[PDB]
Amino acid sequence: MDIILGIRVQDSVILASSKAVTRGISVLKDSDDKTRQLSPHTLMSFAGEAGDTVQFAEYIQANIQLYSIREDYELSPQAVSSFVRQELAKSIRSRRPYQVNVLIGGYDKKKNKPELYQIDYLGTKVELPYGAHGYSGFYTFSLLDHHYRPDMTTEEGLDLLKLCVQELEKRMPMDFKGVIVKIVDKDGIRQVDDF
Amino acid sequence: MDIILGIRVQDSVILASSKAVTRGISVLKDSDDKTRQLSPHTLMSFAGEAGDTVQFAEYIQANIQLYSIREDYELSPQAVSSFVRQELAKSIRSRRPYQVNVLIGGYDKKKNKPELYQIDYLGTKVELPYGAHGYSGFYTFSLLDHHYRPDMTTEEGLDLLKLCVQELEKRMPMDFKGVIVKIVDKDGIRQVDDF
Amino acid sequence: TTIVGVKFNNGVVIAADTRSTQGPIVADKNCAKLHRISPKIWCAGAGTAADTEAVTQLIGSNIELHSLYTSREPRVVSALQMLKQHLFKYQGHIGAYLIVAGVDPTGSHLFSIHAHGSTDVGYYLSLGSGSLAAMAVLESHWKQDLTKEEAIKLASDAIQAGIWNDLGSGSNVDVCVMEIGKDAEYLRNYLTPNVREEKQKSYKFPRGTTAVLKESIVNICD
Amino acid sequence: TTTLAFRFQGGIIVAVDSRATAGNWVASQTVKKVIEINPFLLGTMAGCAADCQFWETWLGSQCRLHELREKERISVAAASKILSNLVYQYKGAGLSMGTMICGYTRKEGPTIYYVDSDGTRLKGDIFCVGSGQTFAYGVLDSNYKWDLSVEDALYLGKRSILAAAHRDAYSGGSVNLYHVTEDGWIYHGNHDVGELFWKVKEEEGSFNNVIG
Amino acid sequence: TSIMAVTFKDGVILGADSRTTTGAYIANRVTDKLTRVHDKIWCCRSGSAADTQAIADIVQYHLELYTSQYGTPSTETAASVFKELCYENKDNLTAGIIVAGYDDKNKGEVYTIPLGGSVHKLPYAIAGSGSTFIYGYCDKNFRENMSKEETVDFIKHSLSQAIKWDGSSGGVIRMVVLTAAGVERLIFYPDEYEQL
Amino acid sequence: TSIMAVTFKDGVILGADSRTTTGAYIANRVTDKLTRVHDKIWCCRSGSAADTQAIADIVQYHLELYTSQYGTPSTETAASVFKELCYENKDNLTAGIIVAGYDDKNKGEVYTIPLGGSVHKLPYAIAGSGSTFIYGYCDKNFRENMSKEETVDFIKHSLSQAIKWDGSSGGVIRMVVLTAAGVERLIFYPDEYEQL
Amino acid sequence: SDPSSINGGIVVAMTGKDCVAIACDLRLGSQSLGVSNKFEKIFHYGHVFLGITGLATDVTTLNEMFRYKTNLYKLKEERAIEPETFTQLVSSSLYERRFGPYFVGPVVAGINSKSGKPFIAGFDLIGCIDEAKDFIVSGTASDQLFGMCESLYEPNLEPEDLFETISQALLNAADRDALSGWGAVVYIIKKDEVVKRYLKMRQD
Amino acid sequence: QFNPYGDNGGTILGIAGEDFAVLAGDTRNITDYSINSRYEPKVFDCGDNIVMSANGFAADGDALVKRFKNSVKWYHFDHNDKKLSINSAARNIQHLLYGKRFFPYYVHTIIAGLDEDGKGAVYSFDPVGSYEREQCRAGGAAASLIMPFLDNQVNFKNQYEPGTNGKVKKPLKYLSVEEVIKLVRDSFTSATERHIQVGDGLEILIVTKDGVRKEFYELKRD
Amino acid sequence: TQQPIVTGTSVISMKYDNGVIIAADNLGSYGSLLRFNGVERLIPVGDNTVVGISGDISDMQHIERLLKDLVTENAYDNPLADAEEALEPSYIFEYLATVMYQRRSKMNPLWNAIIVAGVQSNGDQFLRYVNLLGVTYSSPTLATGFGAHMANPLLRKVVDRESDIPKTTVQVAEEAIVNAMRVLYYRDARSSRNFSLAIIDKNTGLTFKKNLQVENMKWDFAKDIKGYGTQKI
Ligand SMILES: *[C@@](C)(CO)[C@](*)(O)[C@H](Cc1ccccc1)NC(=O)[C@H](Cc1ccc(OC)cc1)NC(=O)[C@H](C)NC(=O)CN1CCOCC1
Ligand SMILES: *[C@@](C)(CO)[C@](*)(O)[C@H](Cc1ccccc1)NC(=O)[C@H](Cc1ccc(OC)cc1)NC(=O)[C@H](C)NC(=O)CN1CCOCC1
Ligand SMILES: *[C@@](C)(CO)[C@](*)(O)[C@H](Cc1ccccc1)NC(=O)[C@H](Cc1ccc(OC)cc1)NC(=O)[C@H](C)NC(=O)CN1CCOCC1
Ligand SMILES: *[C@@](C)(CO)[C@](*)(O)[C@H](Cc1ccccc1)NC(=O)[C@H](Cc1ccc(OC)cc1)NC(=O)[C@H](C)NC(=O)CN1CCOCC1
Ligand SMILES: [Mg+2]
Ligand SMILES: [Mg+2]
Ligand SMILES: [Mg+2]
Ligand SMILES: [Mg+2]
């Protein structure tokens, strides 16, 4: 875990997530996908404590999928994010809290609008044009403050994202083995294979 | 600081040293040379606590250079290493010890033999065919146990060294921004510019 | 805080200051530390502000229900017993230091309760950060067979000692007099010796001084 | 703090913020974090204000004594090393200094040296130092080219501090710009973030995260 | 605190000072440390005021309920109930209690219950911070089958010294006399005992 | 330890037990805690055996050197030298010393020096762990201008009680009598003092 | 790791002549890192306004909680809750979590629809009610707000004047706190109209 | 363990005009919740038209002032009775404070006077020697309360010109001694209301080319 | 770094129209043990100053010796030692205050709280405090330890500010001091009944009173107090 980014543009939400899984002085894996599809038009990336991350992600995934089957209807990104926040808000006052930070990127089909939510392990939710968790934000936020425009295309968003990854690869101490990029739009979720 | 390697072959000693200087969550420099020439046929790489490293390296350098001028004669690599060890052996029981680990690669002109010495901050000296300091050794020693032969050429030694850097770049958690390689032989010290 | 309780001829009187602190900052300049448990049983509270309020309301509620159940006017010892058993149960973690007083069919009473659940009896008592300043006055001027007017004076004098000399106490003096055979009179702001002087200047700004970005009407109706 | 200084075609740009903190208390918004050591030498300050202020003024006295004794302006290398050797003597005692010695000499050309309180001394083309160094790096690195004009370089340095002043809670106040050439340093004014932000937002079209 | 209980010919006498401290500040200088758990069974309390108070209240409740079913309890029974509370809650209590009572069969009896919760039946008992200073005096001066006047003097002189040396002890000397005649409360002021 | 020094008509008497402990083990049951710093100036040692020993040795050296130059020192002078060592090295010492001596002008004198290094001139003094148990007894029984036999009994009875209650005290009761007549050493065994 | 100063923020409330005002900053950060510049801390349940400072997860949680409670209140009582009553509900709810509290500093503001009286109140994280005639302050720059309010405030200000006073109290207090600022919102509340203004403040 | 530091409370305030400067400070001295003195001055005339105050730990503050006063004395001896300029005094104080960098003087120091052009000057210091010239500065316990008020009323921060759409700032201008003293008095009365360590009295020292004048005003004693 | 062993409690004092009064009990506590009862904690320096000391007694005895030595040293080569160049209270105070602060700065303090009361050569009343931290302050009333909490409130009712000093007589001032000492005996657990009191007047000079006792104490009301609440018997 470590680097997870998110950028909301005109017609889509783009999530970038690092591929490295390190333990001790060994990079155990360099092709790890730090995300789960909660519903056809909702994607959640995650980062934090080992074990907790995937256990939490899959638990949320199961609940959203259960809702979808029960009502034969997809929950809005806003509704999913509120559900996720509440689960983390419960968690923080538990015996052993989930130490997991998440980004929820979704496309609301009723509003025809992309939406990006940033939620930390305390249950602190915010809707943003661009978001990041961990040390990544200390570089990317200022960079995006400068280069981001609200009316950008998906292609412009990917170039904006390349600019973030380049900066991180230059100044971050750890080798995070690149990122897996995924786009969320009106047509659902798809993965960019060449980044 | 972090990664410093050394390989003694048939006719030369090859020192590889990482270029990254990191402080906090920022890589401040990616072209740092972690070595000093003590004499025409003796090179010392170093790694450890910030400030201590360069301060120690330059202090040793000054002393060896002073000796060279006084006697109009170059000290043997064995003699230089013994001097360095004693300085660290004093240091460890000082009020504030030098926290510096070093590799001393040299070519003895009287014996016509390359020599590699590994000395830690405690003043623990060993002559070796190949050496490393820090976490690097946990990968490179076993690798060199397998691939190293005592009668290898300088070119074979560089390929053997490339094999180490590749392994480290694959499995090490931190981005160390490549290495500066230097060769010590009968003709003195020279730097490989394309590695 | 600074709180006191004084017994007299035909009853008992309690008093308190009106300062509330959060560190070195005065949170409330005119807070109410005199609490009604029952009509003729009042409580003065020092310590953790919310604890003194909550513990006094809880026992006051249970006292009202008890009074209705027994068809009797509540007694001070009942409030004392209920308070001390509640506080003891929480091993001091509910930081309420109370002076309980009142009149009932048995007579007039004055007690003090500490956070850990220990109770005292006395003719004159003082609790809080300014209790030493107050007790100095009480020990100097108290006597047996005080009148009502003498007891109110002694009580408010003891609170004033805390107001002036203790940094944890200030502002005004609240009093509550509980006399036998009469209604208890709650004297809110009996003394107000710390009125703020006229300011040297009016800091009313010229309209338009503050820069504004947006305006909008908020809908509060259905 | 946030301080930067980078080397380019037309010399050196140096830009700093002006905030001073005492925890979350904003102690000042009008502080000088650049010291003019001589007409060709600058020093940036970051860390403990007193340590930075005291020892860099002391550094200027040592640089003055050098040119009296040697009849020649001190090199950027030698000036930086006086300071780094000084703090190394105090290593462990608790000094907190993040400094950049920027200047020009004939033998060296435009030169920048990073010097900090744990004894690290590094020569380099680009450095950002302080609590908001990362925010400045993000903007600076992504727009930096060697062939920047003096006008563009000055702006990039100003814009990089602004970026950090915005995001970093412990940076802000105003931007102090400097430009170092072969003829010496040139001051390019104090720029209050209170006005500069809105001016940049409007003209550049950036900072879309903020409510306009 | 300084407290003691002494058996004698006609019964038993309890004695105590009146000082309650919160550090070096005297929170109450007229405290009543002698408490009734039954008609002719009383106790002297030392240690935590809150703990000893809560215990005595529970014991008073138990002995009231005992009396309702089985008639007057023995002094040994009262001490057993004190012990049971003190022993089973030893990790959460700081209570040093002396139990004293008068039966007509057993006459005067004294039981001391230290911190641990152990029970010790004795001819006389001393406890509290100020008791350390009078172990020597009390051992040398105590006699069995003393008179009422001799026992009052013994307690008065003993607590006088305990009060003199212990800063945590002072105020008035309260006493409670337990005999077949009934219950008598006594008090002695500083002006009297200080100059003994 | 239990130690004491008492002035009387003809001079002064020092008294002490003989128990030395290392925890609950009695390392020496026949210790001599009464030590000579000058012909007729002695001290009672309580606290760290090593510290009090080192101090007494230095004082003996100072008073020997004083005598060589200025003649016999006063008991006050001896106490001043003790104090100076105890006060100036208070952070590194655990020594409670009673100084007692006999002049012909000043007769018997007693100075007590507690942990801090303060000096207190008194009619009589008690110190050591076992002294706590006899404050009450000693205050009630001490009189000024006692006889030798009365003072010996006072010390014997006092230390007897201190030994009885204090586990850190025991063994024999040693005493040293300081008068114009000279120096007399006394000893009293358990079989005698225990049944007082 | 002090819950009350991780996210940052401030709230201030004032009374005027037949009106009340409540204001807040817009910052939400993670210590030094500023994350959001749209995080409003003032909510309303009918005509009763509530501002909440402190740990942002609890701010969000309590809003959702009081929305829940006031919605049920209205269904059963068949009327909107009043400020004095809501103040008591807040105190109850906070003290319910006495030994595991919400790390917040709430502020109630509103006008009683029956009596027409302006009402403001403040709380500590455990429920202690702080009622006031003049003003209430809360947040990481509470010291600053106390100093600005105590000097600038005067009684019986008209809505248009009160707006200037509260806005200047907030703005200058926020600029001396690192964790507060990044935008601001002011609510001016009259008996039957409410105006909400976004202030222009320095963005550092 | 022995703690060599203490907190004696109080607060100070310096404002600079065009041809004058003021340095004010309350006269209250405290430890914990007790008042030590209601009138213990901590703003001193140090000679050469320099006034100084070191607020925080009084023992350290008195020591520093004492050392600086002595520094002025020896400056005269060693440099032919030359007048010590306010800028030179500031630098001297930095060295006094930094000399104890690893065992600091626990004080926030402020000095005031006139610069070499005759204009009013205020310099402020942290405990270890960092200093800066400003028009305005509050120091001590209630500095967090007062300082933002001064930013608003002395440097006209966040104040725009009415009707200019928040585009034109309120222009900076020097204040009259009469206006400055109004701000000082209002600053301290406000601080006294909400800070328990501030009160009793206010002593102001005004510095003009004619010399040093004093003014005293009562403050609330609770 | 120290810890106090044998200690002395409150020292209280105040100014009146012609001079100053100071008082302190005669106890030397050893923790909770009231060990020594003949301790004098008021030490006169000349015929115009009295130094009242609380805290560690070993350190008090050290200060006694310093003051004793100060008188001797001042007499050296000084024909006006008993006249114009006699020791003033302000001289004695400043000396102690210098020592106290030097010792705290060496992290080896004299664990005391000191009040120097006296009358200057020009008739002015002198009253100033200094403690182990080197902290100094002056006021119409000064007190140490518990005295600061209980005595000052009572003494400030008599002299609340500077203008109240000329209005206060020695009879009124002494009465307030003696009352304060009684209140401290009621409430301070490390206090004694016996105490000393000193008056330094500009006309009558130094009057040192020893072996005073607290009297006219109210204890009678104790007889009516039972248990801790419900106890009727
Ligand atoms: C005087 C003023 C104490 O200084 C009084 O005791 C006063 C009592 C009082 C009673 C009713 C209404 C108002 C005031 N006490 C306080 O004002 C009290 C002081 C205090 C703070 C913290 C404490 O424990 C750490 C104990 C006492 N102030 C408060 O309770 C304030 C309102 N609340 C807080 O500071 C928040 N507390 C909640 C409990 O845990 C610690 C933080
Ligand atoms: C940004 C604002 C983060 O602080 C900058 O680093 C800024 C740099 C700077 C440079 C010159 C003049 C002013 C400011 N640094 C600070 O403002 C600095 C933060 C800091 C404090 C203490 C540190 O370690 C000791 C490191 C950094 N603030 C201060 O120095 C403040 C004004 N002073 C104090 O905190 C006083 N302390 C210093 C340490 O010793 C005790 C007293
Ligand atoms: C003497 C003073 C010492 O043993 C007596 O035992 C005395 C006995 C007594 C007092 C009043 C009523 C009946 C009996 N004990 C006290 O006065 C007691 C001292 C004490 C407190 C706590 C102890 O350990 C928990 C042991 C002894 N005083 C109190 O209990 C006072 C009322 N309260 C406090 O000191 C507050 N405490 C609560 C417990 O935790 C420490 C703070
Ligand atoms: C009674 C027994 C206890 O108070 C006396 O004070 C007695 C005095 C004495 C003994 C022999 C000769 C002359 C005087 N003291 C001891 O027996 C003493 C107990 C003691 C040990 C350490 C102390 O603090 C430093 C205080 C009192 N026993 C010893 O000194 C024995 C011989 N040694 C030890 O116990 C070893 N100590 C070394 C110091 O630290 C812990 C272990
Ligand atoms: Mg977040
Ligand atoms: Mg024995
Ligand atoms: Mg900022
Ligand atoms: Mg007060």
Ligand code: NA
């Ligand atoms: Na900082």
